[PDB]
Amino acid sequence: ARRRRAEVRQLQPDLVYGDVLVTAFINKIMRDGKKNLAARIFYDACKIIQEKTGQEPLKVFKQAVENVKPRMEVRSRRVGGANYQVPMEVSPRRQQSLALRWLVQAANQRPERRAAVRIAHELMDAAEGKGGAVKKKEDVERMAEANRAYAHYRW
Template sequence: FVNKILQRGKRSTAERIMYDALDLVQEKTGDDPVAVLKRAVDNVRPQLEVRSRRVGGATYQVPVEVRPRRATTLAIRWMVGFSRD
């Protein structure tokens, strides 16, 4: 997770941001912050995505299931991306 937060190779800054966020979750909820983070990733994880499929001269958007590892990667990427905005 820290690697997704990392910008310009500043690992110590990314780690500080991550641990501060986990401490904040601990203060606000009183629950285990790692469990809260896992639950958040599970809630954001996509089940389907659309892939382009060319049939004849037309291109169709076909829904396909997302593999578990890709779903987790997308969820983490989305969470980090939207938290930066």
């Protein structure tokens, strides 16, 4: 990005609910590019998140992700003969991506022998305070507010 502040792939909502995140999300779940089963997985992920629970997975994927979505992290610069991990927040879209993605990661670093499950099941423990994702989120986040000893480099 030596020039443009980038035009950001501004996607669209979705056939379902009608909110962007999905297609985005799915895309993450997607692999090798077959949006097909991808889409499926995110739709059927709602199948057990409406079979093991009633709460419309509308706010789940919402109230859930909003917990994964960080608000801090690190990035070190070798000022004086050393790489100092500086503490600082995050932007919307990223904080978002991180959040959104973090799921599908810890979403497969799971047990459930079935895909759609791993997915669905993750979303579950998602909005809970005990989500594979929310761990990393917390983990990475907590890195800061800890190294707060260096936010004088603030940036």
